[PDB]
Design a protein around this ligand. Structure first.
Ligand SMILES: CNC(=O)CN1C[C@@H](C(=O)Nc2cncc3ccccc23)c2cc(Cl)ccc2C1=O
Ligand SMILES: CNC(=O)CN1C[C@@H](C(=O)Nc2cncc3ccccc23)c2cc(Cl)ccc2C1=O
Ligand SMILES: [Cl-]
Ligand SMILES: [Cl-]
Lengths: 305, 299
């Protein structure tokens, strides 16, 4: 019993965190095999940040300009290349602690663990979701750039995020491990703002099925809804549209609890209308949207209470 | 910016998790040097001296990854079983066994079959239970904090209570709370809110730019404690006020000044507003967690 925002064990990722220094800029890198991956803005000198020409800044650099530190050992840079917004530093030592891994690009609504690091040293781990506006509501301070997001289903680490910047609203933007940003963001200190955020509907529904599995049904009603009527109501509360794919994905949880997806949609419609009236669901007074259908199946029991 | 429930990096602890099997019971163990620590109920009103005397070393199967460790000795310390093994753990970190107080927080590495599956942050409730997330097979999962390079082990999971909350011991086998390690009529006591932690989280909201709950008023410690008793909040002591000094100095808001904001939130609610993305007053972040997350401390 119980339902926590659970992160994956960070050990496999801790053994990959290094410190990357270029002139006066220090940030974090990810050392996998003989390559260190880091945000390309490590070559920028703050003023450069307004309109940097990365190709022009990189051509002026040599291998020995990049200092890479793994614990108390300096790694020797023997090559460098840029791939989109990521700098790839070829080093002379393959990481002996390199886990089995993949680079995966995630979609909005997906969750992942974040290993927040400063000076190549991990300081904390937390659970996150890619928001529909492609930002993440993380906890990052100056020096956290290059911190990574990941999932560890089986013994394979899937790296999905690298931290690059904080927007004016306190939310965070970054890239996949191939250097492609999530969202319409640029690694430029230009006037950039996160788009209006929406609630991840499929995740709120998954969390409602998790509340039912843990023994709570106070929020259910005798009504059902069509998918169209549900979406017309949900859009008024700034909820993401629910698609037929989302309904399909909720099938296993619907079968485990005996509550049809559109019947759970009718409970959600009513929760949006009524609020909770002094009650909580899984210890929360708000509708939680940072647990996917897959996270609920992973954490919750296979036997409902 | 941002404020998350953050756990310590679990790597140093992952390298200590093993699977312990005795008879039909399988649970988790903590392998430090040449000793595996696990709940004594792995041998199961139980008489643990009588059950243990009937066991030999070869009755305990200890698995570290895909390698079997050979048990060469065993002893009991309170509610923990200590299995002497023939191999010292090469991944043994620098560590201490510490007993924590209610209100203190720690990270939990939840495991099943000696394999870590998740990490989360939680607090020792005033009623000595932890509101964790554990399923059958989680017994022997451990709680810890990290101070520089040193892991301080503070909790070992033993059982789930009928309300879904959890009970366990320190690493010396002494239970937190009035619990016993046996399936009997046991219940969690009435819980209270950790006042010093709610105040720390209010200072964290101020540091992050959330100030709507601030007011011009102050209060005495006595008047604040009379209001806290009415709302099932733990009494605030002079020690708690002293501990909040650094956060009070960083924000310019006196502790009793913040207490007058908390009294208003208790007597009037949030009125459709949130604090750090929450509609409830959060009590599982200590003053030290707030200073650590709003500073950038690494391990
Ligand atoms: C809040 N930002 C700033 O004051 C200046 N700034 C520096 C840098 C940046 O965001 N770093 C930071 C990353 N994460 C958390 C941060 C918390 C506080 C301060 C800086 C953080 C940056 C990088 C890129 Cl690729 C684009 C823009 C910027 C930028 O605007
Ligand atoms: C809810 N548990 C039960 O009905 C049976 N039960 C088994 C066992 C126990 O609580 N284990 C579990 C621990 N954590 C999560 C669990 C989720 C589900 C089931 C079992 C879990 C136990 C150990 C000790 Cl030392 C004392 C009593 C018991 C006990 O009563
Ligand atoms: Cl995805
Ligand atoms: Cl049910």
């Amino acid at each position: 019993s119980g339902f926590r925002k659970m992160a994956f064990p960070s050990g496999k990722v801790e053994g990959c965190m290094v410190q990357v220094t270029c002139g006066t800029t220090t940030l974090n890198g990810l050392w996998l095999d003989d390559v260190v991956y880091c945000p390309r803005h490590v070559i920028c000198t703050s003023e450069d940040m307004l309109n940097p020409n990365y190709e022009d800044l990189l051509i002026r650099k040599s291998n020995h300009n990049f200092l890479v530190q793994a614990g108390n050992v300096q790694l020797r840079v023997i090559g460098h290349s840029m791939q989109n917004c990521v700098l790839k530093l070829k080093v002379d030592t393959a990481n002996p602690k390199t886990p089995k891994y993949k680079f995966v690009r995630i979609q909005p609504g997906q969750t992942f663990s974040v290993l927040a690091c400063y000076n190549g040293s991990p300081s904390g781990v937390y659970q996150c979701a890619m928001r529909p506006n492609f930002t993440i509501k993380g906890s990052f301070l100056n020096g956290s750039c290059g911190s990574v997001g990941f999932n560890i289903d089986y013994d394979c680490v899937s790296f999905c995020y690298m931290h690059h910047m904080e927007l004016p609203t306190g939310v965070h933007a970054g890239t996949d491990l191939e250097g492609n940003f999530y969202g319409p963001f640029v690694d430029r200190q230009t006037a950039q703002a996160a788009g209006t955020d929406t609630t991840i509907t499929v995740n709120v529904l998954a969390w409602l099925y998790a509340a039912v599995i843990n023994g709570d049904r106070w929020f259910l009603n005798r009504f059902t809804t069509t998918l169209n009527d549900f979406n017309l109501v949900a859009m008024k509360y700034n909820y993401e549209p629910l698609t037929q794919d989302h309904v399909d994905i909720l099938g296993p949880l619907s079968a485990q609890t005996g509550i049809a997806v559109l019947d759970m949609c009718a409970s959600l419609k009513e929760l949006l209308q009524n609020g909770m009236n002094g009650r909580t669901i899984l210890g929360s007074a708000l509708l939680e949207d940072e647990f996917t259908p897959f996270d609920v199946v992973r954490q919750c029991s296979g036997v409902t209470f």
